[model samples]
Target: SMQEEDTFRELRIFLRNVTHRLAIDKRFRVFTKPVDPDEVPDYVTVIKQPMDLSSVISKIDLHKYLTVKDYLRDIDLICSNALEYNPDRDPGDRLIRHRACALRDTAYAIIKEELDEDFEQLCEEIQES
Candidate 1:
């Protein structure tokens, strides 16, 4: 299951980095434009009922997220925190790692509360990163 675990790790990294990137790069862009499901590629992930800008951004993998709200919430928090942590110096090491640790802790709480979904393993991923 290493491949599966690695794939999920990639997804977490994507969730953290992609949303943060979008928050910065797409800050001025509007993601709420309505469209037909038939338009986007079938392989693309997208959420059904988006809540906000970040939620809409997550529409990329909505299907996988449909049943995992905590994972989705942690991703958005990381995105929001990235905005708050807007680093001025070289992005070197601290910011990303710290962000991941903070996220891991948050995800840990969810795992304890939900008491299911093996995805809780992701809580420790940021620390390893």
Candidate 2:
């Protein structure tokens, strides 16, 4: 139905906006792409699961994120992976880890702003004739 198409588009656009902001942020630079196994040899061994904003953006185009909830999960995955890999040991790792926290915080902040209005609007539109 046309309604379904509208709903899908709205969700997809929302995901795109969120990820675009994340990918463009200077703090999220390192997280914009997948970790290079060649550069960080121990990364693969240390982190069994790796997540990145670029990959999340790719999934957005593929319509993998059905809802903001699912999209937020990937955001969490990216930040948590960074946190786990980079403990409070080295200076460089600490910097990356700090950006990870900023990324996570910014993501949630955007979600709260967008979801509060977007989700309400969608639900209201669905109910009205």
Candidate 3:
């Protein structure tokens, strides 16, 4: 979502540029539109490419990205506390308060279940060492 169309446009533009620059060449041949069999150089390898251009663009989901456990927990706490205290003298509508809230919710949601199950168990084991 929020991506399908923009990515396609970029792909087409990129493919067009490649075709213009490298489509008919000795060193490079773009398979964007498809190259004829006889036109292929013997030195070239028939390597595989994507069936379609689905992941050609950056579709990184921030929520799916992971960070160090304790560091992430620290960030979540900081964001939540800042939101609670209403710091920075700018409680304006589109400020970082919303972003911090989002950060806390996402981090907590990701870690809450595991921590609930192993919180003190893991801590005690570490302490005994």
Candidate 4:
């Protein structure tokens, strides 16, 4: 259980790092094409569907056995928030970190919402056992 929790936390950190890199790095170049106002819906759809973390997680046993549902919910929440926070909006390191921190906090909020009853209890159980 401790391992599972740690793994989930690591995964969250990894996601955050990837998000930061993708947003700020010109090499990554998040959006290469010019967007027409009419194509906004299509663009949003394309952006949202490309990286399916659920499919990725489905292949891993560590997440399969733990709080996979909560993990996924948090991931989705964080990703959406990160997109809105878009590192492209601010090139400065401090601004990027601030937005990333906000998204990360949003993620933790989602996790807490999903694991409202079990989070603390799980920690206590692990400690007692």
Q: What are the per-residue Cα lDDT tens digits for candidate 1 across 52-126?
A: 335544554552332235455745544444434334465643555455445445444544574444554553353
Per-residue lDDT, model 3, residue 7, is: 41
TM-score of each: 0.26, 0.85, 0.30, 0.29
The TM-score of predicted model 4 comes to: 0.29
Give the worst 10-residue stretch by lDDT in candidate 3: 51-60
Order the candidate numbers by TM-score, best to worst.
Answer: 2, 3, 4, 1
Error of 3 at 116 (Å): 6.8
- lDDT of every predicted structure (CA atoms): 0.45, 0.82, 0.37, 0.45
Per-residue alpha-carbon lDDT of model 4 for 1-129, expressed as tens digits?
668578556544544444444334453232212334485545554454433233333424344323434444544544554465354545653454455455446445645564445654554464456
Model 1 misplacement above 4 A: 1-57, 69-92, 114-129
> What does the lDDT come to for candidate 4?
0.45
Per-residue lDDT of 1-129 in model 3, one digit per residue for the tens?
245434434434433332243223322222113334587453124323321111211111212112234334444544544354344566552364665555456445644643444543443344344
Clashing pairs in 2: none
Give the candidate number with the greatest lDDT: 2
Residue 44, model 4: lDDT of: 57
